[PDB]
Curated annotation (Swiss-Prot):
Description of how the protein assembles with itself and partners: Component of the BRF-1 ISWI chromatin remodeling complex, at least composed of SMARCA1 and BAZ2B, which regulates the spacing of histone octamers on the DNA template to facilitate access to DNA. Within the BRF-1 ISWI chromatin remodeling complex interacts with SMARCA1; the interaction is direct. Component of the BRF-5 ISWI chromatin remodeling complex, at least composed of SMARCA5/SNF2H and BAZ2B, which regulates the spacing of histone octamers on the DNA template to facilitate access to DNA.
Domain Bromo: 9-113
Record-stated family: Belongs to the WAL family.
Gene that this sequence comes from: BAZ2B
Tissue-level expression: Expressed at varying levels in several tissues, whereas a smaller transcript was expressed specifically in testis.
Span covered, complete protein: 2054 to 2166 of 2168
UniProt-recorded name of the protein: Bromodomain adjacent to zinc finger domain protein 2B
Amino acid sequence: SMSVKKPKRDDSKDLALCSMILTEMETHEDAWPFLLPVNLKLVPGYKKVIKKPMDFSTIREKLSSGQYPNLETFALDVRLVFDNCETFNEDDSDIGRAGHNMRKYFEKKWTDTFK
């Protein structure tokens, strides 16, 4: 509350550390469904169904331009990529499997770097 604060957690390296995670997600062999925005002209149904599209290149641009206020808003966009994927793709598809694989990969790096 006013003039009552928990001890200050050091967030000075968060930007660099999120950038490292994102580089590792970009270079994963199963990243290909997620590298670029889904083409809303060429994929019927995507625009109407997926209210907030997100992909690794859009996260990269937001990160590089100071559009994440803190490390939690970064994680929320990474999770959105995978949540969108599950909304539009069957679990038993190459893309559906890729999304589960990458969500796991992310959640481990997140826990090991920050928790």
